[PDB]
């Protein structure tokens, strides 16, 4: 699924991202329905932006503003998220 999140300057997106460190993308990790990406949503705050848009705990992060991040390290994914400012387009997969 794709979520288009728009937050105000003064709030967060309301999710906690978790996943592999790497600094440089690595490598031939092959996504599978059971582990579709290196980064996922450890939690989502009720009444937060992500939750209102339907993102849920456990969702795996596939794309950030059009860029595939399945094999990308955590620092770099955070950087890409910050680059977009108050707008964030996320593609995710629910392993549920």
């Amino acid at each position: 699924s794709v979520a288009i999140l728009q937050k105000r300057d003064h709030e967060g997106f309301g999710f906690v991202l978790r996943g592999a460190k790497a600094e440089t993308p690595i490598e031939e990790f092959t996504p599978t329905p059971a582990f579709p990406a290196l980064q996922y949503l450890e939690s989502v705050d009720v009444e937060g932006v992500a939750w209102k848009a339907g993102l849920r705990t456990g969702d795996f992060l596939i794309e950030v503003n059009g860029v595939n991040v399945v094999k990308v390290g955590h620092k770099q994914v955070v950087g890409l998220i910050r680059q977009g400012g108050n707008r964030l387009v996320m593609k995710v997969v629910s392993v549920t």
Binding site: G12, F13, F15, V16, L17, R18, G19, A20, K21, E42, H74, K75, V78, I81
Partner: peptide, 6 residues
């Protein structure tokens, strides 16, 4: 792993 609040 790393964990970031966003």
């Amino acid at each position: 792993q790393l964990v970031t609040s966003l």
